[PDB]
């Protein structure tokens, strides 16, 4: 039931397990360039977030997913269903915070978290640069509500970065448009208005903080904030790449960095 609902894939065998969680607007396909490099050394677990366009909209519980905790409960549920005692969790964008939240409730289930395009807060305040002013998010939400198709086409090149006519830009606008308009809007508001800064000192699981040097949703200062405030042992690596989904758009420069962080401990 959980396997089906979240399009769970298990590739490989053995104790050494790796779980990949995707960000907003995409699905497990964001991991296509990474997965080939993991299958020989790990049992690889892929799953889709409830609300992804690949999931049944009838299962999207608005109250359950009003806080990022709903997604954390789902992750723990997938780990328990698969009888996973321990894993390396790689979290892209929102999944990095979902992984961190899951590690608070279940530190036993994670030996390390590798974050990609992570942020605990997108909204700026006079002493915190998250990358977005509330007035701009208000305009972003109204554009999602006004015409979802036109928003997807406009937003995908900006979020992916690089050339506007690339395969990755085309892939992302398709996965964004796969979302049901009302779920996409509700999830967008939930993530963009989230605040995970207060939970950072309480993390015990080692964190590897990776991001593109140019990321529409993640200023470089966010990786330093996470590194300074996470209570766990952490390491930062700012990649010379452009884009929020760099594992998909710039694999040649991003995949080697991710592998180093998965393969080597702090």
Numbering used by the authors: 3 to 268
Q: What does the published report state?
A:
KARRIKIN INSENSITIVE 2 (KAI2) is an α/β hydrolase involved in seed germination and seedling development. It is essential for plant responses to karrikins, a class of butenolide compounds derived from burnt plant material that are structurally similar to strigolactone plant hormones. The overall fold of KAI2 consists of an α/β hydrolase domain and a four helix cap domain. The active site is present in a largely hydrophobic pocket of volume 336 Å3, with a classical serine hydrolase catalytic triad at its base (composed of Ser95-His246-Asp217).
KAI2 was successfully crystallised from sodium/potassium phosphate in two crystal forms, one orthorhombic, P 21 21 21 (a∼64 Å, b∼66 Å, c∼78 Å) and the other monoclinic, P 21 (a∼50 Å, b∼56 Å, c∼52 Å, β∼116°), each with one protein molecule in the asymmetric unit. Monoclinic KAI2c diffracted to 2.11 Å.
